[PDB]
Specification:
Strand content of chain B: 5-15%
Pfam families (chain B): LMWPc (PF01451)
Family (chain B): Belongs to the low molecular weight phosphotyrosine protein phosphatase family.
Catalytic activity (chain B): O-phospho-L-tyrosyl-[protein] + H2O = L-tyrosyl-[protein] + phosphate
Helix content of chain A: under 10%
Oligomer: heterodimer
Shape of chain B: globular
Number of helices of chain B: 5
Largest interface: A-B, 7 and 14 residues
Distance between the termini of chain A: 14 Å
Shape of chain A: elongated
Number of strands of chain B: 4
Radius of gyration of chain B: 15 Å
Strand content of chain A: under 5%
Order of helices and strands of chain B: EHEHEHEHH
Structural class of chain B: alpha/beta
Strand order of the largest sheet of chain B: 2-1-3-4
Enzyme class (chain B): hydrolase
CATH architecture of chain B: 3-Layer(aba) Sandwich
Helix content of chain B: 25-40%
GO molecular function, one term (chain B): protein tyrosine phosphatase activity
């Protein structure tokens, strides 16, 4: 549950 | 004379397990109840890792409590080329990540609460808060206004 995709 | 095509609306969150599935299911049922047929609803998660999973328990429980079906709804990644007529994000990180993932996005991108009189701008993530009721209330505060906006913007029949 992380904001990895797109950062 | 109305536009006689379908239009696609996608709700987008991080995991595509809590917020956007809840919104998708509510929106689909609301359109059915309002006898509106030319809007197709979708959802995506910018960061969904395990794909093809059902919604979070908290979202299933809220939807079940209110007799809102979610048959077949499973987690789907916001793809490098994903685009829809209307994209409705939950929070600012979702907006930012959508635009980074697909800088060529052509659809109209909004936050859910732009369609709400609530003071809040972003829908908090109940993966952490466990506040699924609060999310439900936020979607209900926006849902008919969002529908009305799309029907008028896309020149659809009601």
């Amino acid at each position: 549950h992380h904001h990895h995709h797109g950062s | 004379a109305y536009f006689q095509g379908m239009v696609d609306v996608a709700f987008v969150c991080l995991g595509n397990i809590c917020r956007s599935p809840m919104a998708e299911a509510i929106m689909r049922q609301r359109l059915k109840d309002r006898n509106i047929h030319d809007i197709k609803v979708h959802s995506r998660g910018t960061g969904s890792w395990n794909l093809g999973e059902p919604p979070h328990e908290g979202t299933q429980k809220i939807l079940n409590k209110h007799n809102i079906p979610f048959d077949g709804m499973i987690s789907e990644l916001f793809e490098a080329t994903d685009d829809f007529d209307y994209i409705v994000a939950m929070d600012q990180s979702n907006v930012d990540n959508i635009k980074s993932i697909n800088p060529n996005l052509k659809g109209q991108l909004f936050k859910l609460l732009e369609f709400s009189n609530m003071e809040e701008s972003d829908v908090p993530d109940p993966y952490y808060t466990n506040n699924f009721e609060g999310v439900y209330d936020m979607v209900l505060s926006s849902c008919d206004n969002l529908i009305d906006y799309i029907v008028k913007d896309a020149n659809l029949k009601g």
